[PDB]
Amino acid sequence: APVRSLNCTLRDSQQKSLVMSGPYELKALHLQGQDMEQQVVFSMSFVQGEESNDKIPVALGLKEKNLYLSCVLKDDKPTLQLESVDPKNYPKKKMEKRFVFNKIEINNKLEFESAQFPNWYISTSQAENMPVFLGGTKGGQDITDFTMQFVS
Numbered sequence: 001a002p003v004r005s006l007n008c009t010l011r012d013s014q015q016k017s018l019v020m021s022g023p024y025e026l027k028a029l030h031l032q033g034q035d036m037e038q039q040v041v042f043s044m045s046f047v048q049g050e051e052s053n054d055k056i057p058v059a060l061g062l063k064e065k066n067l068y069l070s071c072v073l074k075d076d077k078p079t080l081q082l083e084s085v086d087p088k089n090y091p092k093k094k095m096e097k098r099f100v101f102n103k104i105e106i107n108n109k110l111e112f113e114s115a116q117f118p119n120w121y122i123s124t125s126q127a128e129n130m131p132v133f134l135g136g137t138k139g140g141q142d143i144t145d146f147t148m149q150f151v152s
């Protein structure tokens, strides 16, 4: 039938929120109070792909926008971008692989592994107001763990 989706926000494990600074830019910063209205709301779709008890394939679109997180090669490294799509055709159950993330439950948080690029994860920096990016380890100094808030 039709792909199922949920509206949500994400916070990294240092409790930074995500905000849209540009058509193709997401940043992470500490936020509280009225300024939380600035956070990005995602539509998380539950898409086709390999699934296990703790690992579920999803796509992450911006709520009511034809923009999705996707993973592509840039300068011979997996990179994260926002990509526009035809709004008549998305979301769909069979999302192209570059749009798919394995949502992994680990230690009461979530990680988002690229389905296209194994062991590359949606990441944030510890510094304030830096771009979200794809980080090719869950060990060192990038933040790869998140919590989800489910939104009306």
Ligand SMILES: Cn1ccc(C(=O)NC[C@@H]2CCCO2)n1
Pocket (backbone or CB within 6 Å): 022, 024, 025, 026, 027, 069, 080, 081, 082, 131, 132, 133
């Ligand atoms: C205009 N600008 C400067 C830096 C960036 C950037 O890194 N964009 C990518 C991130 C990953 C997902 C969307 O934003 N864009």
